[PDB]
Write a protein that binds this ligand. Structure first.
Ligand SMILES: Nc1ncnc2c1ncn2[C@@H]1O[C@H](COP(=O)(O)OP(=O)(O)OP(=O)(O)O)[C@@H](O)[C@H]1O
Ligand SMILES: Nc1ncnc2c1ncn2[C@@H]1O[C@H](COP(=O)(O)OP(=O)(O)OP(=O)(O)O)[C@@H](O)[C@H]1O
Ligand SMILES: Nc1ncnc2c1ncn2[C@@H]1O[C@H](COP(=O)(O)OP(=O)(O)OP(=O)(O)O)[C@@H](O)[C@H]1O
Ligand SMILES: [Mg+2]
Ligand SMILES: [Mg+2]
Lengths: 242, 125, 147, 97, 49, 211, 242, 98, 50, 146
């Protein structure tokens, strides 16, 4: 019984519910966040379930404000509620203080919302991990938010099934470039480790979506990488894994 | 939501109310305090205790002031005493220093605080 | 650590300052003190492996100081400081102290000079109880002979 | 206690405690020349000490498939993914004094 | 309680008899065995001899 | 052994991936025992076979162990449960002693929930009698050598009921799942039964397999 | 009933086991702090640990600025740390607004304390599993440390430590003020109190520290600052040259 | 009764003078340092059994050989306490029910 | 139950004494030993065992 | 002592009886490895020999302290972690007398026969001393009062 809910406590410091929420996020697809010098670059592995689908017509990276990219894994519907909530909170701050929200401020807000869902009998703690960042005027920042309401700064973060492949390769990238790398050069890097993170997920086929927010390419807005730039990334990675 | 408005204190099958039977044991697991009533005065005396000896004890109070004529002293729980001392004072001002513009008699103050305990015996949550 | 930038930079400096070790070495001829300062700044390392390397530069250099008959007093104070500075890795410094005592026995010096330096050196390692001890007994019996 | 005075726990192999295990086990096998373990093993956690010697055995299967006689880091990086995957079949949960 | 129970009928049984208390019987010691039950039996045995 | 007939791979319908793993896991550390040694590794101790009932777990293992020849020991896990201890427990003891003489041999335990209890925290039950044939199993599946050539195949209906001391490699190292059939696989299965009886010549095996 | 510690209800022993379970969960970050009162300052030192190279080291933090005079040092999980950081900020705005001077630390100890009681009196609120150390320098009470805990109990301190290995620190502090025979070190400058603090911590925890493994917060008169890794580096050399 | 009359209880709880003797008899046998004190063992846990005081002192005597030293120092004696501690929330220095 | 253990306690007190007689003072102490025992199993409802 | 089967006289003294079971325990140690078993958990290897190997070589260092000579070890942990390998390595490296007992080969059908082995296996341990008694993967008689 004391292993069933969130308002319970147990004399092991465990609160079994919340730990079970990580297990939800562990069924998700790989999502990485590459922190570069100029901004942030997200990419998500998007499973192609069937050849019946209409392709490139589902976005798992949703914008909050005009400058904070948000991409999440775990329960897809559950995550859509958390993003809607952070779009309310962004909009409240934009009115009350007439500037686009800082990212350490966006962090406070979301952080509070999921923490809330471990203190009542009548709620369930959300089982999603978010990865969100952008450019504000104090510079680019990146945050990963655990379903437990835990978060930290990050020069590279990931979550998903293929968080195993992805993490080791991010170590490789801070030891390649310990003085950082360009946001343009990092499009090709997000392609490379999303492809490698589909060797823990090779029972299907997938589509790669890449988006960026960097100061120096997009004027500090959260945009998608699209057209011919996007296929250069696909080819690059495709040839390394062959 | 919430739906804790059902009583969490109930009669016991054997009679007596279990939760108040539990609470009284707890008073005898605490510190010790006593009071002697004299002809020309009243005294209360109690022990000051802390986790470690390197903690202060002047920043802690177990004899607390309700009115300039009425002090309280407890035995039982520290956290639970702290809140009720504040509520004791709040109700002493709002219902007797606003409506009679002075401090309440001891019997009258006693009774007020006995209602606050009472709704901690009745109702949920 | 959180950056790997210290690692590339530190290791790299170690190899380069072997090539700039002859330029230091001629310079010690004109003024030792200035050369000392240079090798002293070098051995400020935030990366572990490089400590082993940079301490070797100082061992060749101090041979000239030790042989001299005023400058070895100054040498005895610097050994003290090294142990204190950060710790700097507990393998590095414990290899140097030995290599110095070893050098003393081969330099040849006054009965007096030998005694007094040794007391200064056994004293540093009184406030230690790591690798130090092995050496400490050996130079203690070297000193017993003296008295 | 006093029948049983010391209670030693050996926990699961640590972050670079796996790396120390990897080095004795790569001596045993035939290998190309591998000392490029370090990144991959830390972030493929889930291994007990016996499963390190199963990453060697399963890498000598990935090796058999290719028709190779040596453990390659190409064989080894497919092996870590697979070994991890088979143990997530059932969990284990244990707590101590 | 042990010096009443074990030691007093060994030194002289008749102490009981003449007051007119009939002697207690058997001793059960209970408790976690870490409590030094066993330890006490050995302590008074070396002592009574 | 009695010598159980081989059913080969041609009375199997589908199950290509399962055969490939089965030969890989058990049969080839025996035959290429030289190359396991040349490589420098050790053989895996056994292979777990698990997945939903209907997939011909028991059928596959009999057919393939008879085809390739290796001494096939027939043990059903409930037989280890006995109300005797020191005689029921002694079938386990004599089952290694036998097996090390007749080595290389494959010890096929059908079901592994009867002695493969997840429980080892038992409260007030005769489950501490059951687990003494689980414990004695984990001892001889440790080397004190003369077990490097003795293997285990195990079939089981569910794999969520196994002991944490059978999650571990050294016991059953390779862990094979039998999946629900596939489009190609279903069509095959139907043709293997229907070979036995007489059909008309207007049959289409794809039609039945779509439907 | 089998329900008897799912809610904050007394036991046959007359106790709140539920609340005790909070104190077994104040030791999960396994960070340790020690905080000492100088003569005209307060100093609090805590450990910093990062589990990976891939976090940003700056943001990892446990010493949270509440007022510009009241620092707050958190032992126990960072989700409940934040919720505790927020509530406190709320009361600090609230006090200035209605009483027309900045919040006293003393008063923050009782508000956040009474709030804790309210979480163990509702039968649907789970208490924060954070021990807060509040450091301040007041002019009306002098330098003070107030420790609240998940029960809502609190007392003053002459020095205090918190953390799982905090018994060890208690030995150092007890021995130290036994020799001085006074509750506060007679030292007129904050520098040498940072120097003292680190020394007892090196003795107690048995490990020497570095710049990137420390986190230091200092309360002076009328301002609260945190020192960066660079200012901490200076302090460490000067212990060696005493 | 008539087979078993007496029931001699042994309590683990004891009292504050009896933990002091029991620490004190196991310290009579072994060597200590002047650093070491028996009086810092009272303020900790207040429910121990006799075997686990013979146990801590023994475990301290192994820790003693890893420094290499034949006098029990107070560094050793506190670390031994910290292993096989069997911590309670009914004992002194761990309460809020005061 | 209480009075049989009062009578036994007076003769263990006279046993300690080492005099044959039972004296009236033994019965001041004895009455006090059982009445004290009776209250030490009811303040937390502790059994006659561990 | 021997007896005759028709005169019933002691003819001569015989050495002690020694169960047939316990010679298997003295002749399975196989799975052997050096001082080092699994690495990076060396710190726990060194702790083990504090209790076991250190009073074996010199009881005279536990005499200076005036503590009881250390004995008794419980090894417990998550599975597969070389608890069982370490046990084969402290028998190999020191080379002190070993058994052994699996949890469930000392269990017998006949009662007062399963008491017999384990009593008589401590007896053996006092002649062939120093001795290490490795109980392996005990959960069989681990059981409570029930
Ligand atoms: N009062 C004490 N003083 C000194 N040492 C003690 C004390 N109590 C117990 N010990 C030690 O603890 C150990 C256990 O005590 P003892 O030998 O009496 O067994 P026990 O508790 O009856 O165990 P079991 O009956 O299960 O075998 C002994 O080594 C004993 O000397
Ligand atoms: N690949 C196949 N080819 C032809 N028939 C098949 C095939 N696989 C299974 N079958 C049929 O299904 C039957 C059931 O198989 P089997 O008993 O081996 O399976 P299992 O999954 O271990 O189930 P259970 O153990 O519950 O009986 C076979 O006897 C056979 O008739
Ligand atoms: N640390 C290690 N390095 C290399 N091989 C190991 C290591 N530990 C265990 N193994 C391998 O695993 C096999 C079985 O594990 P072992 O029987 O020694 O372990 P255990 O932790 O007591 O668990 P169980 O008793 O359930 O087997 C060994 O025979 C050996 O090949
Ligand atoms: Mg005993
Ligand atoms: Mg084992």
């Amino acid at each position: 019984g004391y292993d069933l809910s969130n308002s319970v406590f147990s004399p092991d410091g465990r609160n079994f519910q919340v730990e079970y929420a990580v297990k939800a996020v562990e069924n998700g697809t790989t999502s990485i966040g590459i922190k570069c010098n100029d901004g942030v670059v997200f990419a998500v592995e998007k499973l192609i379930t069937s050849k019946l689908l209409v392709p490139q017509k589902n976005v798992k990276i949703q914008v909050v404000d005009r400058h904070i990219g948000c991409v999440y894994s775990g329960l897809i519907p559950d995550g859509r509620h958390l993003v809607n909530r952070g779009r309310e909170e962004a909009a409240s701050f934009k009115k009350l203080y007439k500037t686009p929200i800082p990212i350490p401020a966006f962090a406070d807000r979301l952080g509070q919302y999921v923490q809330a869902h471990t203190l009542y009998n009548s709620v369930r703690p959300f089982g999603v991990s978010t990865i969100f960042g952008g450019v504000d005027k104090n510079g680019a920042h990146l945050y990963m938010l655990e379903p437990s309401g835990s978060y930290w700064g990050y020069k590279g973060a990931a979550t998903g099934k293929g968080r195993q492949s992805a993490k080791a390769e991010l170590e490789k990238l801070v030891d390649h470039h310990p003085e950082g790398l360009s946001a343009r050069e990092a499009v090709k890097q997000a392609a490379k480790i999303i492809y490698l993170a589909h060797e823990d997920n090779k029972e299907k086929d997938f589509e790669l979506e890449i988006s960026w927010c960097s100061l120096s390419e997009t004027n500090g807005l959260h945009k998608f990488v699209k057209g011919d730039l996007l296929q250069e990334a696909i080819d690059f990675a495709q040839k390394e894994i062959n | 939501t919430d739906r804790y408005s059902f009583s969490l204190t109930t009669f016991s099958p054997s009679g007596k109310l279990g939760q108040i039977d539990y609470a009284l044991t707890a008073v005898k697991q605490g510190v010790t305090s006593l009071g002697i009533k004299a002809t020309n005065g009243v005294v209360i005396a109690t022990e000051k205790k802390s986790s470690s000896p390197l903690a202060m004890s002047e920043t802690l109070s177990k004899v607390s002031l309700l009115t300039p004529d009425i002090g309280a002293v407890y035995s039982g729980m520290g956290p639970d005493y702290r809140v009720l001392v504040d509520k004791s004072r709040k109700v002493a001002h709002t219902s007797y220093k606003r409506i009679y513009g002075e401090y309440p008699p001891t019997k009258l103050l006693v009774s007020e605080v006995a209602k606050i305990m009472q709704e901690a015996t009745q109702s949920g949550g | 650590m959180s950056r790997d930038a210290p690692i590339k930079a530190d290791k790299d400096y170690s190899q380069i300052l072997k090539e700039e070790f002859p330029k230091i070495d001629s310079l010690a001829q004109n003024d030792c003190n200035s050369a000392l300062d240079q090798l002293l700044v070098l051995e400020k390392k935030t990366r572990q492996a490089s400590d082993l390397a940079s301490s070797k530069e100082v061992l060749a250099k101090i041979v000239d100081l030790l042989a001299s008959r005023n400058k070895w007093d100054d040498l005895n104070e610097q050994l003290t400081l090294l142990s204190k500075k950060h710790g700097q890795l507990k393998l590095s410094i414990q290899y140097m102290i030995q290599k110095v005592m070893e050098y003393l026995k081969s330099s040849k010096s006054l009965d007096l000079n030998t005694r007094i330096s040794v007391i200064e050196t056994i004293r540093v390692v009184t406030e230690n109880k790591i690798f130090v001890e092995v050496e400490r007994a050996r130079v203690t019996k070297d000193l017993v002979e003296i008295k | 206690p006093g029948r049983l005075d010391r209670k030693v726990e050996i926990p699961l192999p640590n972050e670079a405690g796996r790396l120390e295990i990897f080095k004795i086990h790569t001596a045993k096998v035939k290998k190309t020349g591998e000392f490029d373990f370090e990144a991959a093993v830390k972030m493929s956690d889930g291994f007990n000490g016996a499963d390190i010697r199963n990453c060697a055995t399963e890498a000598g299967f990935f090796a058999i498939r290719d028709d190779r006689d040596h453990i390659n880091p190409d064989d080894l990086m497919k092996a870590v993914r697979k070994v991890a995957e088979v143990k997530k079949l059932e969990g284990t949960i244990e707590y101590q004094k | 309680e042990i010096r009443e129970a074990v030691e007093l009928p060994l030194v002289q049984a008749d102490l009981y008899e003449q007051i007119g208390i009939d002697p207690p019987r058997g001793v059960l010691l209970y408790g976690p065995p870490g409590t030094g039950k066993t330890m006490l039996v050995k302590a008074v045995a070396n002592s009574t001899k | 052994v009695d010598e159980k007939p081989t059913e080969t791979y041609s009375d199997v319908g589908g199950l290509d991936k399962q055969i490939e793993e089965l030969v890989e896991a058990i049969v080839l550390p025996m035959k290429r025992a030289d190359k396991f040694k040349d490589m420098g590794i050790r053989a895996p101790k056994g292979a777990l076979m698990y997945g939903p009932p209907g997939t011909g777990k028991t059928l596959l293992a009999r057919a393939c162990a008879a085809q390739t020849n290796a001494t096939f020991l027939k043990l059903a896990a409930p037989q280890l449960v006995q109300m005797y201890i020191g005689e029921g427990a002694k079938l386990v003891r004599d089952a290694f002693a036998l097996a090390k003489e007749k080595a290389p041999t494959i010890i096929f335990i059908d079901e592994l929930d009867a002695i493969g209890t997840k429980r080892f925290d038992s409260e007030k039950s005769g489950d501490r009698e059951v687990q003494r044939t689980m414990l004695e199993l984990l001892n001889q599946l440790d080397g004190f050598s003369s077990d490097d050539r003795v293997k285990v195949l195990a079939a089981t209906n569910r794999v969520d009921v196994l002991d944490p001391a059978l999650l571990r490699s050294g016991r059953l190292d390779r862990k094979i799942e039998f999946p629900l059939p596939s489009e190609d696989s279903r069509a095959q299965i139907l043709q293997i039964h229907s070979r036995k009886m007489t059909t008309d010549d207007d049959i289409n095996w794809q039609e039945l397999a779509r439907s | 009933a089998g329900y008897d510690r799912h809610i904050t209800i007394f036991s046959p022993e007359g106790r709140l086991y539920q609340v005790e379970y909070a104190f077994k969960a104040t030791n999960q970050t396994n960070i340790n702090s020690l905080a000492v009162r100088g003569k005209d300052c307060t100093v609090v030192i805590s450990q910093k640990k990062v589990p990976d190279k891939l976090l940003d080291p700056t943001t990892v933090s446990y010493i949270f600025c509440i007022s510009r005079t009241i620092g707050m040092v958190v032992n126990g999980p960072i989700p409940d740390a934040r919720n505790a950081a927020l509530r406190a900020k709320a009361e600090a705005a609230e006090f200035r607004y209605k009483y027309g001077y900045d919040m006293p630390c003393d008063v923050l100890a009782k508000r956040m304390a009474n709030l804790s009681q309210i979480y163990t009196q509702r039968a649907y609120m789970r208490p924060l599993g954070v021990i807060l150390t509040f450091v301040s320098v007041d002019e009306e009470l002098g330098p003070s440390i107030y420790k609240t805990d998940p029960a809502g109990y609190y007392v003053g301190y002459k020095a205090t430590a918190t953390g799982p290995k905090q018994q060890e620190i208690t030995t150092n502090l007890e021995n130290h003020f036994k020799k001085s025979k006074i509750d506060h070190i007679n030292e007129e400058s904050w520098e040498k109190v940072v120097e003292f603090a680190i020394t007892h911590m090196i003795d107690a925890l048995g490990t020497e520290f570095s710049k990137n493994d420390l986190e230091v917060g200092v309360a002076t008169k009328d301002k609260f600052f945190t020192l960066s890794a660079e200012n901490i580096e200076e302090r460490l050399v000067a212990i060696a040259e005493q | 009764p008539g087979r078993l009359d007496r029931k001699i209880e042994f309590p683990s709880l004891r009292d504050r003078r009896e933990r002091r003797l029991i620490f004190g008899t196991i310290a009579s046998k072994m060597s200590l340092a002047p650093e070491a004190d028996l009086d810092s063992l009272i303020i900790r846990n207040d429910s121990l059994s006799g075997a686990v005081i013979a146990a801590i002192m023994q475990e301290a005597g192994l820790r003693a050989v890893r420094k290499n030293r034949y006098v029990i120092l107070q560094s050793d004696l506190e670390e031994a306490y910290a292993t096989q501690v069997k911590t309670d929330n009914t004992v002194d220095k761990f309460d809020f029910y005061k | 139950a209480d009075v049989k253990g009062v009578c036994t306690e007076a003769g263990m007190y006279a046993l300690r004494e080492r005099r044959i007689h039972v004296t009236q003072e033994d019965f001041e102490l004895a009455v006090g030993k059982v009445m004290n025992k009776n209250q030490e199993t009811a303040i937390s409802v502790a059994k006659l065992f561990k | 002592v021997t007896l005759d089967i028709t005169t019933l006289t002691i003819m001569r003294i015989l050495p002690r009886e020694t169960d047939p079971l316990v010679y298997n325990m003295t002749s399975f140690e196989q799975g052997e490895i050096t001082f080092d078993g699994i690495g990076g958990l060396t710190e726990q290897i060194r702790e083990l020999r504090e209790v076991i190997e250190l009073p074996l070589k010199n009881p005279e260092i536990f005499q200076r302290v005036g503590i009881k000579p250390p004995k008794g070890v419980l090894l417990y942990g998550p599975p597969g972690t070389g608890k069982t390998l370490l046990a084969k390595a402290v028998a190999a490296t020191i080379g002190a007398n070993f058994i052994f007992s699996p949890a469930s080969g000392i269990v017998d059908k006949y009662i007062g026969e399963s008491a017999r082995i384990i009593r008589e296996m401590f007896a053996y341990a006092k002649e062939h001393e120093p001795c290490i008694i490795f109980m392996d993967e005990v959960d069989a008689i681990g059981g409570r009062r029930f």
